[PDB]
Amino acid sequence: MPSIKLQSSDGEIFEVDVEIAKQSVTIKTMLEDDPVPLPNVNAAILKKVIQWCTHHKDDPDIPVWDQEFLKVDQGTLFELILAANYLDIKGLLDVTCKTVANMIKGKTPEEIRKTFNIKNDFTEEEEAQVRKENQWCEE
Amino acid sequence: AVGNINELPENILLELFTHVPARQLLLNCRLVCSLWRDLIDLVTLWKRKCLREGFITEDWDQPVADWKIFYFLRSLHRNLLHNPCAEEGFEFWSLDVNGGDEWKVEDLSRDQRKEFPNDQVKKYFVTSYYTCLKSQVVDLKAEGYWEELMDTTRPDIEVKDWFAARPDCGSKYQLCVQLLSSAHAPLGTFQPDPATIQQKSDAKWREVSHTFSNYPPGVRYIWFQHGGVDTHYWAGWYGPRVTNSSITIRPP
């Protein structure tokens, strides 16, 4: 009202209030008579992005709503971060990045590795070298 | 699909680390794997935590030996002296000597408020006609400066204080600041030369200032004491006035 058309990576087209879909600084710039295409964002992920943006269109410590909305699996979080990054939507980049950062809080190295299924790259002498460099910072 | 946090772009991983409290990044996250260790040891992560929190801007143009250190110290930076202007009476201060008609608290003139390059000094402490001294001890650990930070980095310790005394004043302004060990044993003392104190005793607000550098390992407390010591010639009902005292720890 007026509305622009957005094509996801897997065919599906979407239309959106032009001023809601300008929380993205990427598309904002592109507007300056087709459908704009988005290689890196698929349907599942694009739908949540316009959603997050419509809820946040009227707007001037992670709001309750943002927390429930983001109660998804690691993998779709990751893709959320990426779209946010590619579309350049600061607000969304920030809560997603925080939400992932909150899963790193309070945990040991082994506990972090396990949450994200990361393999210990390290030799035991490389580990010991890292604790040494962290001397200034321990109690 | 991204099937693992480490398939994210480096730039995003940096962005994530940004939101992890720094202490935890260093102790826990440098250990998770070698990618994380390499990423966390880049200047750019810290450089831009600093930016997200106001400690610096785009026009930052000074060499910084270690950005992790720089970051923590700026993050902890604030006056470590409680109730330095007299917004809450004598709370937090020991009236070590409280002679005469005693220490008072009183309001600054709107004219005298300008003499501070802060708008936010609205009161002072003033001494009586006999000697009056007060004190406060800073507990470094308890203010966020853990031990190995003090010992390893030896960050600069900056002390300031403002007073006003007439040249003719019946009691002379005095200031002593000592660094102290875990035993409360002195590890460096500062008193300003009395000559340059008398020089500052026109009737206006003057700063006095000092920075301790290269102090030894072991510093756990700082003792700060000030007031007026009686000259023994009467010259009025009050002596030095003092306010806006401060102690901070700055990136060295």
What are A9-13's contacts with CB under 8 Å, separation 24+?
A9/A38, A9/A39, A9/A40, A9/A41, A9/A42, A9/A43, A10/A42, A10/A43, A11/A43, A12/A43, A12/A46
CA B136 to chain centre: 13
Residue B95 shares a structural domain with residue B178: yes
- Experimentally determined by: X-ray
Question: Last residue of a domain, which of B66, B96, B117?
Answer: B66
CB contacts of A137 in chain B (<8 Å) are: 23, 26-27, 68, 148-149
Residue from B84, B101, B94, B185 nearest B137 by CA: B94
3-state secondary structure of A100: helix
Question: Last residue of a domain, which of B21, B46, B66?
Answer: B66
Asked if B33 and A138 come within 8 Å (Cβ–Cβ), the reply is no
Residue B39 shares a structural domain with residue B87: no
Asked if A97 and B24 come within 8 Å (Cβ–Cβ), the reply is no
Residue B56 shares a structural domain with residue B80: no
3-state secondary structure of A16: strand
CA atoms of A52 and A59, how far apart (whole Å): 12
- Strand duo B156-164 + B132-139: pairing: unpaired
Residue B30 shares a structural domain with residue B133: no
- In A, minimum Cα distance to B72 occurs at A137
Query: Tokens 């044993």 sit at which residue?
Result: B185
CB contacts of B5 in chain A (<8 Å) are: 74, 78, 100, 116, 118
Range of the domain at B55: 1-66
Residue B40 shares a structural domain with residue B89: no
First to last CA, chain A: 60
**SS3 of chain A: helix, strand, coil, percent, to 5:** 55, 10, 35
CA atoms of B63 and B40, how far apart (whole Å): 19
Asked if B4 and A100 come within 8 Å (Cβ–Cβ), the reply is no
Q: Of 3.30.710.10, 3.40.228.10, 3.90.650.10, 3.20.20.140, which CATH number belongs to A1-139?
A: 3.30.710.10
Peptide bond into A2 cis (omega under 30): yes
CB contacts of B8 in chain A (<8 Å) are: 78, 81-82
Residue B45 shares a structural domain with residue B99: no
- Whether the CB-CB separation of B129 and B239 falls below 8 Å is answered with yes
Residue B54 shares a structural domain with residue B178: no
CB atoms within 10 A of CB A94: 17
- In B, minimum Cα distance to A40 occurs at B1
Residue from B230, B242, B246, B235 nearest B100 by CA: B230
3-state secondary structure of B73: helix
Question: How big is chain B by its Cα radius of gyration, in Å?
Answer: 23
| A65–chain B Cβ distance below 8 A for any pair | no
The CATH number for B6's domain is 1.20.1280.50
| B29–chain A Cβ distance below 8 A for any pair | yes
The residues spanned by each domain of chain A are 1-139
Residue B55 shares a structural domain with residue B83: no
Q: Where are the alpha helices (DSSP H) in A1-108?
A: 25-30, 43-55, 64-69, 74-87, 90-102
Residue B72 shares a structural domain with residue B17: no
CA–CA distances in Å: residue A32 to residues A7, A27, A53, B10: 18, 9, 21, 30
Return all residues near B91 (Cβ < 8 A) that are at least 6 apart: B82, B83
| A105–chain B Cβ distance below 8 A for any pair | yes
Question: Last residue of a domain, which of B25, B41, B66?
Answer: B66
